[PDB]
């Protein structure tokens, strides 16, 4: 698991539309509370979350995503993050259930990114 925390680096040389994803995707990563358990990859088996890699079989986090965009070769096109960044929600929902604090944060985070999103873009 990557040490320390993500360095903020918005690279000149992505896409606009992907630069300005990774700006929003940055701010929720270091800034909102909420984000706290989707932040960095689990180390399931030191937490004890013992079956964790069999239920989830794609994991996934903020650092992950925000090392991927900044390390490139894994995405084109902003549909793609999105579609890792909804798996961390829909992992936390699998694996937490529903109705736990930890996927109505999850939630929130969802709902936070979109409205962060929708300001850049006036």
Same mark, same amino acid.
């Given at each position: 698991?990557? *040490? ?13 539309? $992907? ?5 929003? @995707?940055? *701010? +929720?990563? %270091?800034? /909102? ?10 180390? %399931? +088996? !030191? ?6 890699? &069999?239920? $989830? #079989?794609?994991?996934?986090?903020? !650092? #992950? ?10 995405? &084109? ?9 909804? +798996? $961390?929600? *829909?992992?936390?929902? !699998?694996?937490?259930? =529903?109705?736990?604090?930890? =996927?109505?944060? %999850?939630?929130?985070?969802? =709902? $936070? @990114?979109?409205?962060?999103? /929708?300001? @850049? =873009?006036?």
């Amino acid at each position: 698991l990557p *040490k320390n925390k993500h360095v903020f680096h918005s690279d000149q040389r992505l896409a606009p539309e $992907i630069r300005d994803l990774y700006d929003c @995707l940055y *701010k +929720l990563y %270091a800034e /909102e509370s909420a984000s706290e358990y989707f932040r960095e990859p689990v180390d %399931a +088996l !030191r937490v004890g979350a013992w079956n964790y890699y &069999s239920v $989830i #079989t794609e994991p996934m986090s903020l !650092r #992950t995503v925000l090392d991927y965009i900044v390390q490139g070769g894994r995405y &084109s096109h902003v549909e793609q993050i999105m579609n890792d960044v909804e +798996l $961390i929600w *829909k992992n936390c929902e !699998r694996y937490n259930g =529903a109705e736990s604090h930890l =996927a109505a944060d %999850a939630r929130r985070c969802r =709902a $936070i @990114l979109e409205k962060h999103r /929708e300001r @850049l =873009a006036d």
